[PDB]
Amino acid sequence: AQELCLYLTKAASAPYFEVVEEHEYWDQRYTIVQQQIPSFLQKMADKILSTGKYLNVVRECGEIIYTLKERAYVEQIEKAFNYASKVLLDFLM
Amino acid sequence: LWHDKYTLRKSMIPSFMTMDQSRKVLLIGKSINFLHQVCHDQTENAFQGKIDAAYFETSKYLLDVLNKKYSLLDHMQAMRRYLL
């Protein structure tokens, strides 16, 4: 029943990992919801929100798997946030 | 993360592991648990050889990440020049 509950969460997470709530001057656009935090990404609750936020101020202008005691996904997020800024910061200089 | 959060349970040690071997696992586990969180980094007779193989590699790597990414030695010398 640990192979099963890994088959569900592997499929019940593809929609989430293909898109933090948005709104409609820029600190009220996207804001963290505190309840719905996985409590194993709580360490990086600020780099996720900061990673996509930089992608939108440029867009409107013009794989992850869960493992225990292994942080292959915690490292995978830092490898994209370290690029999310290098495209926007360079976009303003 | 070294002084506390790890306790050698004297009661649940199997008889087929000597009391000294039980302090080399509590030290290899602690060496890897501490290497991830604080250091911010991610990676019979054959049984006795496995513990020592996991010891002479993990600890030797803990110093490398603690001398190149933090220069633990370069502070001991610098803490003598000024503070002493």
Swiss-Prot record, chain A:
Domain of life: Eukaryota
Organ and tissue specificity: Ubiquitously expressed.
Compartments reported by the entry: Cytoplasm, Cytoskeleton, Microtubule organizing center, Centrosome
The family this protein is said to belong to: Belongs to the TUBGCP family.
Assembly and binders: Component of the gamma-tubulin ring complex (gTuRC) consisting of TUBGCP2, TUBGCP3, TUBGCP4, TUBGCP5 and TUBGCP6 and gamma-tubulin TUBG1 or TUBG2. TUBGCP2, TUBGCP3, TUBGCP4, TUBGCP5 and TUBGCP6 assemble in a 5:5:2:1:1 stoichiometry; each is associated with a gamma-tubulin, thereby arranging 14 gamma-tubulins in a helical manner. Gamma-tubulin at the first position is blocked by TUBGCP3 at the last position, allowing 13 protafilaments to grow into a microtubule.
Record: disease: Cortical dysplasia, complex, with other brain malformations 15: An autosomal recessive disorder characterized by global developmental delay, variably impaired intellectual development, speech delay, facial dysmorphism, microcephaly, and varying degrees of cortical malformations including pachygyria, thin corpus callosum and subcortical band heterotopia. Most patients have generalized seizures.
Known function: Component of the gamma-tubulin ring complex (gTuRC) which mediates microtubule nucleation. The gTuRC regulates the minus-end nucleation of alpha-beta tubulin heterodimers that grow into microtubule protafilaments, a critical step in centrosome duplication and spindle formation. Plays a role in neuronal migration.
Protein's UniProt name: Gamma-tubulin complex component 2
UniProt source species: Homo sapiens
Recorded name of the encoding gene: TUBGCP2
UniProtKB/Swiss-Prot annotation, chain B:
Recorded superkingdom: Eukaryota
Cell location: Cytoplasm, Cytoskeleton, Microtubule organizing center, Centrosome
Disulfide linkage: none
Tissue-specificity statement: Ubiquitously expressed.
Record note on quaternary structure: Component of the gamma-tubulin ring complex (gTuRC) consisting of TUBGCP2, TUBGCP3, TUBGCP4, TUBGCP5 and TUBGCP6 and gamma-tubulin TUBG1 or TUBG2. TUBGCP2, TUBGCP3, TUBGCP4, TUBGCP5 and TUBGCP6 assemble in a 5:5:2:1:1 stoichiometry; each is associated with a gamma-tubulin, thereby arranging 14 gamma-tubulins in a helical manner. Gamma-tubulin at the first position is blocked by TUBGCP3 at the last position, allowing 13 protafilaments to grow into a microtubule.
Functional description taken from the UniProt entry: Component of the gamma-tubulin ring complex (gTuRC) which mediates microtubule nucleation. The gTuRC regulates the minus-end nucleation of alpha-beta tubulin heterodimers that grow into microtubule protafilaments, a critical step in centrosome duplication and spindle formation.
Similarity section: Belongs to the TUBGCP family.
Protein name, per record: Gamma-tubulin complex component 3
Species the sequence originates in: Homo sapiens
Gene name tied to this protein: TUBGCP3
Full-protein positions shown: 459 to 567 of 907
